[PDB]
């Protein structure tokens, strides 16, 4: 059920971020029943918000620099994220990956690609499931994430 855990984490992250941005169609509500997954999500929102704020200007204009269209959106996502992890995986980089993905979703909502927001959830879940899963489990999974940011 690992792809779905990742999908629910990124969905929660992005829904909360869109809500705060005034872009969420309807109310924010967390649907995560697993107490531990909820704790993971809450911490990820906290550290992602902190990372984004520390580099607000960079994250704000990132998607504009990429000249995103419907046809280049996924290839650009894969290209950016592959480059990010090509010189290593760590938890800070995973957070930056999540923040970038949320900025993509904001870009999509604001620049007339709102239907692609739900695609981000699947893109991130698939990326985590295929390319980061081995690393994540080798680094004690979400307990290692929570330890790292304590």
């Amino acid at each position: 059920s690992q792809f779905l855990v990742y999908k629910n984490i990124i969905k929660d992250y992005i829904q909360s971020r869109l809500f705060n941005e005034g872009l969420l169609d309807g109310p924010y509500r967390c649907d995560i029943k697993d107490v531990k997954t909820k704790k993971v999500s809450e911490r990820l929102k906290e550290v992602g918000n902190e990372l984004e704020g520390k580099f607000k200007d960079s994250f704000s204009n990132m998607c504009e620099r990429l000249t995103i269209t419907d046809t280049t959106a996924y290839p650009t996502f894969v290209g950016v994220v592959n480059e990010l992890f090509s010189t290593g995986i760590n938890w800070g980089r995973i957070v930056a990956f999540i923040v970038f993905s949320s900025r993509l979703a904001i870009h999509f909502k604001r620049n007339g690609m709102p239907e692609y927001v739900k695609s981000v959830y699947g893109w991130v879940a698939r990326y985590m499931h295929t390319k980061l899963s081995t690393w994540i489990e080798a680094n004690r999974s979400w307990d290692g994430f929570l330890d790292h940011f304590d």
Binding site: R65, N90, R93
Partner: peptide
């Protein structure tokens, strides 16, 4: 040299930089 590679490399440094605090 691509904007894709430029932005990915940038994100890597942002994540590395962000991590320092938490081992300090």
């Amino acid at each position: 040299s691509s904007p894709t590679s430029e932005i990915g490399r940038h994100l890597a440094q942002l994540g590395d930089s962000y991590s320092v605090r938490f081992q300090n």
